[PDB]
Paper text:
We determined the structure of hASCT2, reconstituted into lipid nanodiscs and in the presence of the inhibitor Lc-[name], at 3.4 Å resolution using single-particle cryo-EM. The protein adopts a single symmetrical state with all three protomers in the same outward-facing conformation, in which Lc-[name] precludes HP2 from closing. This density further protruded outside the region occupied by glutamine in the previous structures in two directions, indicative of multiple ligand binding modes. While the “ligand-down” orientation resembled the one predicted from docking studies, the “ligand-up” orientation represents an empirically determined binding mode. In general, ligand-up Lc-[name] is coordinated by binding site residues S353 and D464, while ligand-down Lc-[name] is coordinated by S353, D464, and N471.
Multiple structures of human SLC1 members and their prokaryotic homologs, combined with biophysical data, have demonstrated that these transporters operate using an elevator transport mechanism. Subsequently, the inward-open structure of hASCT2 indicates that the transporter works using a single gate mechanism, in which hairpin loop 2 (HP2) controls access to the substrate binding site on both the intracellular and extracellular sides of the membrane.
Numbering used by the authors:
A (entry chain B), B (entry chain A), C (entry chain C): 47 to 488
Write the structure that this text describes.
Amino acid sequence: RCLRANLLVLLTVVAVVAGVALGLGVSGAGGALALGPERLSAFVFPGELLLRLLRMIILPLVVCSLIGGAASLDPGALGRLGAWALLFFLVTTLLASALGVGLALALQPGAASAAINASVGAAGSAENAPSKEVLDSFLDLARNIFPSNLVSAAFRSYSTTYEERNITGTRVKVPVGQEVEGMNILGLVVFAIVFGVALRKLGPEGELLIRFFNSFNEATMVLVSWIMWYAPVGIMFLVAGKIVEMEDVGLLFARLGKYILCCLLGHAIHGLLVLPLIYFLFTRKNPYRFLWGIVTPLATAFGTSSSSATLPLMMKCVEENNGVAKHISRFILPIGATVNMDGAALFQCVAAVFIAQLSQQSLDFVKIITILVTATASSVGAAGIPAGGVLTLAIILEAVNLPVDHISLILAVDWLVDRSCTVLNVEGDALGAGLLQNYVDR
Amino acid sequence: RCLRANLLVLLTVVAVVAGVALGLGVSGAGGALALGPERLSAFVFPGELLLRLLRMIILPLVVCSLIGGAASLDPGALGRLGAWALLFFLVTTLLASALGVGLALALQPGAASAAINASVGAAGSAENAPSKEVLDSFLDLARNIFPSNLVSAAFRSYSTTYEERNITGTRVKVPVGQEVEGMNILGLVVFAIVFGVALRKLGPEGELLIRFFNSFNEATMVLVSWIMWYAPVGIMFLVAGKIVEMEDVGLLFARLGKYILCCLLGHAIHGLLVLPLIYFLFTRKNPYRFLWGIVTPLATAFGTSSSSATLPLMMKCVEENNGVAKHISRFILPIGATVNMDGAALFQCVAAVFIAQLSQQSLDFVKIITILVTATASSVGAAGIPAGGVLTLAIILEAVNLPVDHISLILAVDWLVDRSCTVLNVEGDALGAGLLQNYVDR
Amino acid sequence: RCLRANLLVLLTVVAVVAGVALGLGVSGAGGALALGPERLSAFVFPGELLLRLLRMIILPLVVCSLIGGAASLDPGALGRLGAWALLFFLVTTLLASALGVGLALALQPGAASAAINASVGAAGSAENAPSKEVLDSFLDLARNIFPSNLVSAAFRSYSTTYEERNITGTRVKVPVGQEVEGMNILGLVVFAIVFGVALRKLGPEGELLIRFFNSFNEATMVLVSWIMWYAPVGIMFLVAGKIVEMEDVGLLFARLGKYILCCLLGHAIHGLLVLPLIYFLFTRKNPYRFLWGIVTPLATAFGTSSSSATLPLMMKCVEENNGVAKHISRFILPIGATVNMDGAALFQCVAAVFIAQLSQQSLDFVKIITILVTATASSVGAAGIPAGGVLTLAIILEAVNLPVDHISLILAVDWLVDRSCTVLNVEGDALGAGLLQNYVDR
Ligand SMILES: O=C(O[C@H]1CN[C@@H](C(=O)O)C1)c1ccc(-c2ccccc2)cc1
Ligand SMILES: O=C(O[C@H]1CN[C@@H](C(=O)O)C1)c1ccc(-c2ccccc2)cc1
Ligand SMILES: O=C(O[C@H]1CN[C@@H](C(=O)O)C1)c1ccc(-c2ccccc2)cc1
């Protein structure tokens, strides 16, 4: 039934296109001048509503799916599957970062152009920042792993601010911990996996609880169906709002065309050559067919700019349409969302290479390897914190000591490049799931 | 067994009467002068303890009751029942507001009297307020519906504060969202209903989870029995404390006797003529008998001044004493608590008409319809936020542009009129439940 | 199998000893000068990680264990068991406080010595404090009992701050309530016990839910096994960090040797004479054998300085190694953690007697009884709040009006005496559990 099967894909693609058209027409016809902030809020509000709906269920779906997936195969096979999955995610993120270096080095987006100016963008506010240390970031990562409280971890994460409690002499900023807002999805993932392993360690005592969590996840999936049918309206209004919030006639594109083209080309090459090649090599099945199987979550990722929020739609589509195993999907895809960020590592490395290319920095071999490794680690470093969309580049440049004086340049265009990132991240998650499904099948 | 059956009703009526007597005697004998703030806190503390007990269980009871009630009848009948229930609540709230207009217009409580003075009450602090817009209130309503996180929604709700982030020129206050304290009971209600529909959409997978939630609610009901047996002491001490906290020899009654009489008469006429007439018309069963069946929750509502807190006692009494169906009770009465506020719409409209009557405003037909509709919507607008006992009148007067210069007059007497409101709200909920029980039975 | 059975006890004792050796060697070899704050954080971080792991599971384990234990015996036997348990805890805490008086009165640690000076310790900051009233502390105790919301009670507790809302004349600080951080484990304990009683009041409806909670606790116990195998590393690094954080060559020991010896001797006499004597008297079974059965939780208590955090390890060890009944363990030991603080009452009373001994206060009989009773109540008073490690001594001295001018003396050495306190508290809990197991068996 092609007509009914492909209705959703048609609807979300039409939603994205019509949202772009609506926003461009509104901005050309007057935009904010004809709109006002109140009508801007009402115009963006369906987008915020879709993101509120999809952030409501990631906690149930992630927790109960991992508990229902971990306790479906014995811990030996689970350990092997988790290890090969982490290896796959690490390799894909590393390949993405290397592709970013190879593109930004060649196209040279940091050539002398309008982007050389940065007074308007920075205006002295770029240097002023928390300036989180790399060690403190890794410690906050390993403290969001192994949370102090599960309930608080359902909406809070650990962030190490810096006070000035060294009045005795030579004032040095000292760390203090204070829980902030944002889900600790990594901690919940680890707790859930460990829980499911514990239930598999038990036998008849755990059958009730596995049945509970599987039923709960199936109910949440039934909610996901209806959220999916709502999603095109939210995507349309969200995209229209996010191109009405700033003019996009071509001024910022004319400013940063090489950088944005480098990022989008890197994302497409990662998402249409590298990972499809890996899938074909390993499972020997049509990767582009599979990519068409998941267009609706990809479009939702482009519209939402949030990997965790698109995940319920993705797990529904992957388990339903494509012939991916239910337990493998449950175990892999949430872990893919919180660890695999191919696009994030890609455009972080490309941004670093761009800001280094302007001012003519060297970056011969050692610094290249450094940016690769720290991008690969920051793939998960940025994952626990939702606020740090591109904030993690500052700590990278602190590690390797580059000019952070114009990091605010990307914040004007973060809302565009970070969407293709989300597309590629969920794509890499699904491809890892398919590969590991075939590996477990063999 | 009349002697044992009616013991609780006797006990709570005696508790209210003895609390009034105790508070009046203490205030006459010296009150605070003989008491001190520390003994005032210890004297009110049983009231705070009862409210802490009854706010502990509304989350379990509401969530699990709606999940156990929604998934007891098919979604078609559920949709019809929900639609006729919302229609009933809307009509009753609208009739209440019209009754408020009809009374305040006739009795004319805003005649020239001591209430004309407002310097002592306002003293310039009335105008200073957040001044929340109507659109922003509706957006916060629809964002507390569809919460971002369920756990946070168990004790937090979305409130749009206003910052001054327009330093570029012509400083205009802009909205920012920051979650504040207070349960998001509307969001939990909607999520729970949707969940129960999902479990009914499933079949054998959901039987475990329905059995879980029904067992959990029955346990919470067993707690409610013991809280009910404690409740008269809390009501007595609470009422005594809340008339010791301000002198009530008759000064404020002598000031606002017409307004308070208008509100109480409107509440009694709504609760003893209109809704009993509707019940008799539809189900043809003794409505006043049924009203006597629920005296203990009504007295608890008068003592507590909180509709959500009396709800566990109400659902216990309605399912136990009166022959109302268990599933219909579960589905309707929580929704009645968070949506139906007949008394709130009533005294909000009466307060508006009173402040308009002083200063001799017109309010011919269009403004009357405006106050009716905005009161009907604010019935649920005030429901998500517990702090806004009468705060929502300011946004109404912002919509229709009346003198808010003396809104602080009612805050001295909010603690009295708002209790009969709670009585009428729970009464309207129970009457809707009885009507819809008979409709489903037919 | 002695070699495998005793491996854990050997490992944690070796961990404590090696941590002491590591910290002393690091402090002697340069300590902070060779370390820096960043490496100090990385060196302490395994300790923080162990405490984050053990605070993650006390909520599941406590809640589900009490629900699974309360609903294993009928409410009559439960009421008797709870009453005799509270009587036992009260008597043991009182005996501990009397032992503290008897030791501090005899050894006279407040003799004229270096400890007479307090300018360096206090420096005027001792008097400045919230100065919480005793009545307000008891009210906050009874409001953390019977929480307003269960979810918030999973990570928040009620603390009555004091504002200055008496500008009308004679500015007097007035209480305001605002929820702060810290688990409301007492409120969750009471709610859980009451819930389990409700499920036992029900019959077949509750079997599912009891099976759920028992399965959930068994899963959490399976997590506890692995946390236990990790624990020695955390204890070693934590102890090393907490003796590197301050020099302990003997300066503070040379300052307060009599006071610390009094506290440790009181703890050992309570833990090795009084309670073993009671156990032998009642159950007639080798108490020192039983004490050896639980060395790993005792060492964890010494390392962690947290009674609640060691509790999962304790309940695992008591149910596994020693022949204590599962249901009795579940019901008693969590209640022991939140109520029984023998060591806390002990060193609080000893600290009071020490600060009274300096400056030559009388403390004849009435004040002795007062310190005993308020210490016995503050055993649970300090339990709800985790921040108040020794903060509760100030409110005691407010009750009985002693010099609080040098309360900051103990804060330098709170990290040492408060560890043996934790050891004795968990010891008293386990001994009460064994006694009541034998009583129920008889
Ligand atoms: O850390 C993240 O990733 C960054 C790198 N790529 C971008 C992406 O694709 O998300 C962002 C992140 C994840 C999720 C959310 C999120 C947003 C709305 C609602 C709920 C959650 C934000 C930030
Ligand atoms: O918004 C509400 O309604 C207003 C209009 N009528 C009044 C009523 O009857 O409650 C108030 C509201 C509901 C519930 C609480 C509440 C109070 C204590 C504890 C827990 C909850 C407060 C305010
Ligand atoms: O109030 C308490 O007791 C005091 C008297 N003796 C001391 C003890 O043995 O704990 C402290 C308390 C309990 C538990 C924690 C706690 C610490 C870390 C992580 C989680 C929790 C703190 C303070």
